[model samples]
Target: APSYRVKRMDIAKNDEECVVNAAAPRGLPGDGVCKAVYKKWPESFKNSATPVGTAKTVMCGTYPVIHAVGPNFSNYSESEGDRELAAAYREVAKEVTRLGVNSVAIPLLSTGVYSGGKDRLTQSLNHLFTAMDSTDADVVIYCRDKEWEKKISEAIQMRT
Candidate 1:
């Protein structure tokens, strides 16, 4: 068993509460899931309501489904790249922790789909890790790519 009291599950499972969808930007609808923020929160993209994939929003729960910034996706007016993405996660992390989640799931923001921006992605993720430590929350860094798997591990160790 894991040391922590919380359970860990893959994002593909619909029942996952703190899901870190290992998906590229705008790729949510392709899985048949509707954008959670599109309906509940304000969206920058006009097509927020359009459901493109198989994943549909089932029962809405209090848990946060973090969508880390993938390279191809950005809700900002301009490309803040990884810097903005990291800042966004820090902001979101504060809110999520306040709501009482001890753990969070994260994808490598702005790495894939958003290529040639590794520097930015690294900085943002590192920032999130620091924020997580300070807030006393555990983090699960999920990477769909093997390369990123190592990348996240390194970033986390830098914190140690």
Candidate 2:
């Protein structure tokens, strides 16, 4: 599962500390899977506490998870859009290495409600690859919904 490009699964169910593809800069947004993450944890995940492209480690009860606040791709240009996406991933790498984490589960970052469009997913995935590679951990991308997997995995394959 470490090298798996995409998986049909639940992030909360994972044994490894997972990354939340979060929203907004204050308190983890309470919608979609963010809702799931927020409800599972001890308290609200505030973005101001970490800021975009920075990964803040929080405890999910006894487990420590990484939260990444990536840019809203809708708000950025082609070149700049993925810049913070890679940065967000780089931030994840730092936490992983510092914690000596061997494996981790990550989300599609800005692709959810923050998604720019179908045209830009591949570009984000490219940067995500760089971020994942930089992390130096066994990585599994848990894309969540079935519909997302179809388009997401196809884009992921285009680059592989």
Candidate 3:
């Protein structure tokens, strides 16, 4: 299993860099995270853009963000399940390993648009946690609010 911990903190203010999910061929500005990232690094997520499984490091406000093209916007939903989600997490694991970073932060991939508003907090984290099991980096998954924080805490507890 991955030597990692899940924490509920301000993603933008966190000390370590974070992984931002982007749509393949370009990222969508449909949410705050994507908007902030795009507002800072429009070129990375542009049309015919950087391919998936690649990591683009850029500075966004207070955070040094790793805009990782992980999920498919057209298929953003809970149904993508563990296998597909784990592949996305593996992309991050490979990139982070290549960067030689000790730690990284990330949000729950695909739980926003793809989940159809249904909460997939546990499912998303489980996939990521499983994918990161072989890596040595400390994984921090950010929770946007109190409810999310509580849910994340529960998920972590269940995993442990």
Best candidate, lDDT: 2
Tens-place lDDT per residue, model 3, 1-160, is 3445556654545556555544333545556556655655555454424444454555444444566555543555435444566676777777777667778877777666555556667677777777677678777777667888887777677757
What digit string (tens of lDDT, one per residue) describes model 2 on residues 53-147?
Answer: 78788765556667777777678775676677788878877877787777787777777677676444555566667767666677767766787
Report lDDT per candidate: 0.43, 0.67, 0.61
Best by TM-score: 2
lDDT of 3: 0.61
> What are the models' TM-scores?
0.55, 0.78, 0.71
lDDT of 1 at 132: 59
C-alpha RMSD for every candidate: 7.7, 3.1, 4.0
On the 0 to 100 scale, the lDDT of residue 73 in model 3 is 38
Candidate ordering by lDDT (highest first):
2, 3, 1
Off by over 4 Å in 1: 1-10, 13-17, 20-59, 67-79, 116-121
Better of 2 and 3 by lDDT: 2
For model 3, what is the alpha-carbon lDDT of residue 39? 57
Preferred candidate (TM-score higher): 1 or 2 = 2
Candidate 1 displacement at residue 9 in angstroms: 9.2
